Amino acid sequence: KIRFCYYRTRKRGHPGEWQGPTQVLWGGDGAIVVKDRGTDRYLVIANKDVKFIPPPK
Amino acid sequence: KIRFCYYRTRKRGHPGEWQGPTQVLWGGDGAIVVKDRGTDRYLVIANKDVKFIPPPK
Ligand SMILES: [Cl-]
């Protein structure tokens, strides 16, 4: 059930480096929530800036 | 189990008007996720800026 992903943030629309992997804490409609361990804050990430790690085959 | 709340955001530390009511979409450690009705955007709200609405007696 636990999902992991890579994610990135945006600075004035410019995409940042891929960060993670980190646990997908919540999955919404078009976005997820992750815990950014640098700032220790929850971040809302749009799905276009998420790379979901495929579950084990 | 559906939880609703009032929430507020701050402008340079000053708390604004209470907004909502709106559904508590996710509960984390010290913060929640809501969807802003006006902007259709997910927001992370620190618990001290949340008023959870109790169910009827
Ligand atoms: Cl946070």
Side-chain angles (χ1 to χ4, degrees):
Chain A
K1 180 50 180 168
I2 310 102
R3 299 184 293 157
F4 288 85
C5 71
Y6 290 90
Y7 71 100
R8 63 186 180 186
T9 56
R10 303 244 168 197
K11 282 194 248 296
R12 305 180 296 267
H14 297 216
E17 296 203 328
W18 289 111
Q19 300 185 67
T22 200
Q23 182 177 346
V24 181
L25 301 180
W26 180 74
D29 166 12
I32 71 172
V33 170
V34 302
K35 188 60 162 297
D36 190 83
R37 62 179 198 163
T39 59
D40 195 54
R41 309 189 81 97
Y42 296 111
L43 295 181
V44 170
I45 311 298
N47 283 346
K48 78 180 66 59
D49 294 324
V50 179
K51 290 298 183 183
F52 293 96
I53 298 183
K57 335 172 66 179
Chain B
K1 184 58 186 41
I2 308 174
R3 272 204 309 175
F4 267 56
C5 75
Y6 313 116
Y7 72 97
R8 62 185 178 184
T9 68
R10 300 174 176 250
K11 294 171 181 163
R12 306 170 63 194
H14 303 262
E17 282 330 273
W18 288 109
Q19 311 185 40
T22 196
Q23 181 175 355
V24 179
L25 301 178
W26 183 69
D29 177 40
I32 63 155
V33 178
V34 300
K35 176 172 264 306
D36 188 302
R37 206 137 51 217
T39 67
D40 215 35
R41 208 227 185 283
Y42 294 113
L43 301 176
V44 173
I45 309 294
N47 282 349
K48 70 177 171 72
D49 289 326
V50 178
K51 278 182 179 294
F52 294 103
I53 298 166
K57 276 174 278 294

mmCIF file of all heavy atoms in Angstrom, chain A residues 8-33:
data_model
loop_
_atom_site.group_PDB
_atom_site.id
_atom_site.type_symbol
_atom_site.label_atom_id
_atom_site.label_comp_id
_atom_site.label_asym_id
_atom_site.label_seq_id
_atom_site.Cartn_x
_atom_site.Cartn_y
_atom_site.Cartn_z
ATOM 1 N N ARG A 8 9.498 17.099 -7.541
ATOM 2 C CA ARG A 8 10.243 18.331 -7.739
ATOM 3 C C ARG A 8 9.342 19.513 -7.417
ATOM 4 O O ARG A 8 8.115 19.417 -7.484
ATOM 5 C CB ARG A 8 10.793 18.429 -9.168
ATOM 6 C CG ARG A 8 9.734 18.473 -10.258
ATOM 7 C CD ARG A 8 10.380 18.416 -11.632
ATOM 8 N NE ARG A 8 9.389 18.461 -12.704
ATOM 9 C CZ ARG A 8 9.678 18.313 -13.993
ATOM 10 N NH1 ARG A 8 10.930 18.108 -14.374
ATOM 11 N NH2 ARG A 8 8.715 18.372 -14.902
ATOM 12 N N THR A 9 9.964 20.621 -7.039
ATOM 13 C CA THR A 9 9.265 21.869 -6.782
ATOM 14 C C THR A 9 9.554 22.848 -7.911
ATOM 15 O O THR A 9 10.394 22.603 -8.780
ATOM 16 C CB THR A 9 9.676 22.460 -5.428
ATOM 17 O OG1 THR A 9 11.097 22.638 -5.394
ATOM 18 C CG2 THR A 9 9.274 21.510 -4.305
ATOM 19 N N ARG A 10 8.828 23.958 -7.893
ATOM 20 C CA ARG A 10 8.924 24.992 -8.913
ATOM 21 C C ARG A 10 9.304 26.314 -8.266
ATOM 22 O O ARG A 10 8.805 26.652 -7.189
ATOM 23 C CB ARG A 10 7.597 25.158 -9.660
ATOM 24 C CG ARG A 10 7.090 23.892 -10.300
ATOM 25 C CD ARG A 10 7.042 24.039 -11.794
ATOM 26 N NE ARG A 10 6.818 22.758 -12.451
ATOM 27 C CZ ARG A 10 7.054 22.543 -13.739
ATOM 28 N NH1 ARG A 10 7.520 23.527 -14.499
ATOM 29 N NH2 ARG A 10 6.840 21.345 -14.261
ATOM 30 N N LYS A 11 10.185 27.060 -8.927
ATOM 31 C CA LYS A 11 10.537 28.419 -8.516
ATOM 32 C C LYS A 11 10.050 29.348 -9.619
ATOM 33 O O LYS A 11 10.662 29.429 -10.687
ATOM 34 C CB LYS A 11 12.038 28.569 -8.275
ATOM 35 C CG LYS A 11 12.524 28.002 -6.943
ATOM 36 C CD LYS A 11 13.933 28.486 -6.609
ATOM 37 C CE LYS A 11 14.951 27.351 -6.659
ATOM 38 N NZ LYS A 11 14.684 26.311 -5.626
ATOM 39 N N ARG A 12 8.934 30.033 -9.360
ATOM 40 C CA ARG A 12 8.308 30.912 -10.349
ATOM 41 C C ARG A 12 8.050 30.163 -11.656
ATOM 42 O O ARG A 12 8.258 30.691 -12.752
ATOM 43 C CB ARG A 12 9.158 32.164 -10.586
ATOM 44 C CG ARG A 12 9.468 32.943 -9.312
ATOM 45 C CD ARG A 12 10.305 34.183 -9.591
ATOM 46 N NE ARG A 12 11.629 33.852 -10.114
ATOM 47 C CZ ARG A 12 12.717 33.706 -9.363
ATOM 48 N NH1 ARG A 12 12.645 33.863 -8.048
ATOM 49 N NH2 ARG A 12 13.878 33.404 -9.929
ATOM 50 N N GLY A 13 7.612 28.908 -11.536
ATOM 51 C CA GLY A 13 7.275 28.084 -12.675
ATOM 52 C C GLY A 13 8.410 27.245 -13.229
ATOM 53 O O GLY A 13 8.153 26.323 -14.014
ATOM 54 N N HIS A 14 9.657 27.543 -12.860
ATOM 55 C CA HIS A 14 10.793 26.786 -13.374
ATOM 56 C C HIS A 14 10.947 25.489 -12.589
ATOM 57 O O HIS A 14 11.003 25.524 -11.350
ATOM 58 C CB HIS A 14 12.088 27.615 -13.277
ATOM 59 C CG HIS A 14 12.072 28.865 -14.092
ATOM 60 N ND1 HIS A 14 13.191 29.351 -14.741
ATOM 61 C CD2 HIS A 14 11.096 29.760 -14.354
ATOM 62 C CE1 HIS A 14 12.906 30.466 -15.375
ATOM 63 N NE2 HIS A 14 11.631 30.743 -15.156
ATOM 64 N N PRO A 15 11.011 24.332 -13.252
ATOM 65 C CA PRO A 15 11.090 23.060 -12.526
ATOM 66 C C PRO A 15 12.458 22.852 -11.892
ATOM 67 O O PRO A 15 13.494 23.126 -12.505
ATOM 68 C CB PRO A 15 10.819 22.016 -13.612
ATOM 69 C CG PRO A 15 11.312 22.655 -14.866
ATOM 70 C CD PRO A 15 11.006 24.135 -14.716
ATOM 71 N N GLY A 16 12.455 22.342 -10.661
ATOM 72 C CA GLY A 16 13.679 22.046 -9.948
ATOM 73 C C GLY A 16 14.179 20.636 -10.200
ATOM 74 O O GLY A 16 13.619 19.869 -10.991
ATOM 75 N N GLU A 17 15.264 20.294 -9.511
ATOM 76 C CA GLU A 17 15.818 18.949 -9.585
ATOM 77 C C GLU A 17 14.868 17.928 -8.971
ATOM 78 O O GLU A 17 14.107 18.227 -8.045
ATOM 79 C CB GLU A 17 17.158 18.872 -8.854
ATOM 80 C CG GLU A 17 18.253 19.723 -9.452
ATOM 81 C CD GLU A 17 19.633 19.211 -9.091
ATOM 82 O OE1 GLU A 17 19.791 18.643 -7.989
ATOM 83 O OE2 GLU A 17 20.558 19.367 -9.915
ATOM 84 N N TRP A 18 14.938 16.702 -9.481
ATOM 85 C CA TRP A 18 14.173 15.613 -8.888
ATOM 86 C C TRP A 18 14.716 15.300 -7.503
ATOM 87 O O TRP A 18 15.925 15.124 -7.321
ATOM 88 C CB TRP A 18 14.226 14.369 -9.772
ATOM 89 C CG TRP A 18 13.442 14.515 -11.029
ATOM 90 C CD1 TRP A 18 13.936 14.605 -12.301
ATOM 91 C CD2 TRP A 18 12.018 14.607 -11.144
ATOM 92 N NE1 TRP A 18 12.906 14.738 -13.199
ATOM 93 C CE2 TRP A 18 11.717 14.744 -12.516
ATOM 94 C CE3 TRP A 18 10.966 14.579 -10.221
ATOM 95 C CZ2 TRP A 18 10.411 14.851 -12.986
ATOM 96 C CZ3 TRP A 18 9.668 14.687 -10.691
ATOM 97 C CH2 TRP A 18 9.403 14.824 -12.061
ATOM 98 N N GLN A 19 13.820 15.246 -6.527
ATOM 99 C CA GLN A 19 14.170 14.947 -5.149
ATOM 100 C C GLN A 19 13.534 13.630 -4.736
ATOM 101 O O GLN A 19 12.550 13.177 -5.325
ATOM 102 C CB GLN A 19 13.713 16.066 -4.204
ATOM 103 C CG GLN A 19 14.335 17.419 -4.514
ATOM 104 C CD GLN A 19 13.960 18.481 -3.501
ATOM 105 O OE1 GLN A 19 14.358 18.415 -2.336
ATOM 106 N NE2 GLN A 19 13.188 19.468 -3.939
ATOM 107 N N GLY A 20 14.109 13.024 -3.706
ATOM 108 C CA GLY A 20 13.596 11.773 -3.198
ATOM 109 C C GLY A 20 14.546 10.626 -3.471
ATOM 110 O O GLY A 20 15.727 10.847 -3.737
ATOM 111 N N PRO A 21 14.035 9.387 -3.443
ATOM 112 C CA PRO A 21 12.625 9.032 -3.255
ATOM 113 C C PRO A 21 12.086 9.340 -1.861
ATOM 114 O O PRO A 21 12.832 9.375 -0.882
ATOM 115 C CB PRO A 21 12.608 7.519 -3.522
ATOM 116 C CG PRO A 21 13.838 7.256 -4.320
ATOM 117 C CD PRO A 21 14.854 8.215 -3.791
ATOM 118 N N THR A 22 10.780 9.579 -1.790
ATOM 119 C CA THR A 22 10.110 9.883 -0.538
ATOM 120 C C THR A 22 8.726 9.257 -0.579
ATOM 121 O O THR A 22 8.183 8.966 -1.647
ATOM 122 C CB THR A 22 10.014 11.401 -0.293
ATOM 123 O OG1 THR A 22 9.782 11.654 1.096
ATOM 124 C CG2 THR A 22 8.876 12.004 -1.102
ATOM 125 N N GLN A 23 8.163 9.033 0.602
ATOM 126 C CA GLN A 23 6.867 8.379 0.682
ATOM 127 C C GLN A 23 5.761 9.325 0.224
ATOM 128 O O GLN A 23 5.759 10.514 0.556
ATOM 129 C CB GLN A 23 6.607 7.897 2.108
ATOM 130 C CG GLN A 23 5.288 7.165 2.281
ATOM 131 C CD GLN A 23 5.097 6.635 3.687
ATOM 132 O OE1 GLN A 23 6.037 6.585 4.482
ATOM 133 N NE2 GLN A 23 3.874 6.240 4.002
ATOM 134 N N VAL A 24 4.831 8.796 -0.567
ATOM 135 C CA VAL A 24 3.617 9.529 -0.913
ATOM 136 C C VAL A 24 2.704 9.472 0.307
ATOM 137 O O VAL A 24 2.166 8.415 0.641
ATOM 138 C CB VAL A 24 2.931 8.939 -2.151
ATOM 139 C CG1 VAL A 24 1.681 9.745 -2.507
ATOM 140 C CG2 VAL A 24 3.906 8.884 -3.326
ATOM 141 N N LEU A 25 2.550 10.605 0.993
ATOM 142 C CA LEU A 25 1.797 10.597 2.241
ATOM 143 C C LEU A 25 0.297 10.696 2.005
ATOM 144 O O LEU A 25 -0.490 10.195 2.815
ATOM 145 C CB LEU A 25 2.264 11.735 3.145
ATOM 146 C CG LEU A 25 3.747 11.676 3.513
ATOM 147 C CD1 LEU A 25 4.125 12.841 4.419
ATOM 148 C CD2 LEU A 25 4.094 10.343 4.171
ATOM 149 N N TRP A 26 -0.109 11.330 0.911
ATOM 150 C CA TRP A 26 -1.516 11.471 0.579
ATOM 151 C C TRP A 26 -1.632 11.668 -0.921
ATOM 152 O O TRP A 26 -0.820 12.372 -1.525
ATOM 153 C CB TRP A 26 -2.157 12.645 1.326
ATOM 154 C CG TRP A 26 -3.606 12.827 1.009
ATOM 155 C CD1 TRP A 26 -4.643 12.045 1.434
ATOM 156 C CD2 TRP A 26 -4.187 13.858 0.200
ATOM 157 N NE1 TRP A 26 -5.831 12.524 0.939
ATOM 158 C CE2 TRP A 26 -5.580 13.636 0.180
ATOM 159 C CE3 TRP A 26 -3.666 14.947 -0.507
ATOM 160 C CZ2 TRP A 26 -6.456 14.462 -0.521
ATOM 161 C CZ3 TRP A 26 -4.541 15.767 -1.202
ATOM 162 C CH2 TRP A 26 -5.919 15.522 -1.200
ATOM 163 N N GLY A 27 -2.630 11.024 -1.516
ATOM 164 C CA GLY A 27 -2.886 11.169 -2.932
ATOM 165 C C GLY A 27 -4.222 11.832 -3.181
ATOM 166 O O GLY A 27 -5.267 11.289 -2.816
ATOM 167 N N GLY A 28 -4.200 13.016 -3.780
ATOM 168 C CA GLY A 28 -5.402 13.749 -4.094
ATOM 169 C C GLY A 28 -5.781 13.641 -5.555
ATOM 170 O O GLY A 28 -5.326 12.752 -6.284
ATOM 171 N N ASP A 29 -6.638 14.563 -5.988
ATOM 172 C CA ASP A 29 -7.068 14.660 -7.380
ATOM 173 C C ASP A 29 -6.057 15.549 -8.095
ATOM 174 O O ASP A 29 -6.132 16.777 -8.027
ATOM 175 C CB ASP A 29 -8.494 15.208 -7.446
ATOM 176 C CG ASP A 29 -8.917 15.654 -8.846
ATOM 177 O OD1 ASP A 29 -8.222 15.358 -9.841
ATOM 178 O OD2 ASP A 29 -9.983 16.302 -8.946
ATOM 179 N N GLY A 30 -5.102 14.925 -8.781
ATOM 180 C CA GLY A 30 -4.103 15.650 -9.539
ATOM 181 C C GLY A 30 -2.881 16.090 -8.760
ATOM 182 O O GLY A 30 -2.010 16.755 -9.337
ATOM 183 N N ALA A 31 -2.777 15.742 -7.479
ATOM 184 C CA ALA A 31 -1.654 16.179 -6.661
ATOM 185 C C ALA A 31 -1.446 15.190 -5.526
ATOM 186 O O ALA A 31 -2.327 14.388 -5.206
ATOM 187 C CB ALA A 31 -1.881 17.591 -6.104
ATOM 188 N N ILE A 32 -0.261 15.261 -4.913
ATOM 189 C CA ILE A 32 0.077 14.455 -3.748
ATOM 190 C C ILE A 32 0.671 15.360 -2.675
ATOM 191 O O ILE A 32 1.005 16.521 -2.917
ATOM 192 C CB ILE A 32 1.072 13.320 -4.075
ATOM 193 C CG1 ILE A 32 2.457 13.912 -4.368
ATOM 194 C CG2 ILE A 32 0.565 12.463 -5.228
ATOM 195 C CD1 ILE A 32 3.569 12.868 -4.523
ATOM 196 N N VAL A 33 0.831 14.791 -1.483
ATOM 197 C CA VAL A 33 1.514 15.439 -0.372
ATOM 198 C C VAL A 33 2.743 14.610 -0.020
ATOM 199 O O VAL A 33 2.662 13.378 0.070
ATOM 200 C CB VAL A 33 0.581 15.604 0.843
ATOM 201 C CG1 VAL A 33 1.364 16.041 2.071
ATOM 202 C CG2 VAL A 33 -0.509 16.613 0.523
#
